[PDB]
Symmetry: D2
Subunit: 118 residues, 4 copies
């Protein structure tokens, strides 16, 4: 299932818990210095025709050591299987002035698995 410790293709660590009511809660680490709170939602009653499980979550990149004045949201689906994975697309929006709002948002794609790259 979704609950557990996941790693993306860059070594970041996604420690998540999926609650019964549809919640996602946890920590995202890019040690404690580099660790941040997360929260999100997931479809707690997915289709039964082979489709994956829809979900999303948010990290604001502030903690007690640093603040980058930004937030990433990941939107994706869990795909169960021999090598379970969470395939996401993400949007990183930074706090900008109006003048710089056109370049406020980065987009990318993260694949999470249970194994950490070397």
């Amino acid at each position: 299932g979704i609950t557990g410790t996941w790693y993306n293709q860059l070594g970041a660590t996604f420690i998540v818990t999926a609650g019964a009511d549809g919640a996602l809660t946890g920590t995202y680490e890019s040690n404690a210095e580099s660790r941040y709170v997360l929260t999100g939602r997931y479809d707690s009653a997915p289709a039964t025709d082979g489709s994956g499980t829809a979900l999303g979550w948010t990290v604001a990149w502030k903690n007690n050591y640093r603040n980058a004045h930004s937030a990433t949201t990941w939107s994706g689906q869990y795909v169960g299987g021999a090598e379970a994975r969470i395939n996401t697309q993400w949007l990183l929006t930074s706090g900008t002035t109006e003048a710089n709002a056109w370049k406020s948002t980065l987009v990318g794609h993260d694949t999470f698995t249970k194994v950490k790259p070397s």
Copy 2:
């Protein structure tokens, strides 16, 4: 104060009801009637820069409630811009649960803007 807590309306008649807590959290509901209401959660920067920049945030809605399930989730990533005409400018990703064969068509992308009045 952060200025985010309250009711927000988008360009299509949707209604976003949120509370911004002291620990950086966003919680609330997103709706159109009970059949159209859904839970949300997210994060925001509680210590934004003081150089005129907006306030980074993000939130997620999974499209299941007690009355229906679209096997889908939307994440909104963006920033709060205070002032007379406060607004929250976002970009969103809607991922549907799909089979892998159909995964290429799993994610819709768009943008929404929210205001305090309709």
Copy 3:
């Protein structure tokens, strides 16, 4: 309907021609209008849209190199033209910058632009 001069919300200027079975050509520049700010674009559109009231799908690219400047990057816009009532072109875009592999995660910006034949 697509052939013409369009402007986005930030005042960029898009001069485009739609050819017989689907080509888009033209140029893209800044509202300042200096030549150092002008770039080539190319793209495609649907030359036989539906007859049910739906818009016309299209897209194009600009690489941000010209004779004066090189940002080592490129934007693509994807959208639809919808006619009558004041023609509009509603788009989403992607800007990719050349990066080392180590920085590829930060290579791409996303946004949206709406163009009208009015400034």
Copy 4:
């Protein structure tokens, strides 16, 4: 290093020429003959020589003489050279829609192409 034939993992093939002027022109076959479409776009014809990749983008409108999906895809990305050359992209697919359905007009995704079939 861009000119030639590129493949994805979905059975798509495209043949492109990277012109000395920055143009990209070619054909995109969505299914390995009634499935071929024109492609055109642009790329950075003087990239850096510091390890960075080469920026590029292209479009395909899904109409040909035999069929028409009333839609178009744009890919934005970069070429990475070397023994193991790649084109790494993000893409957007927009369909023609009525305004009532415009909220659902655009799909987003990513695709990587290689020189090895």
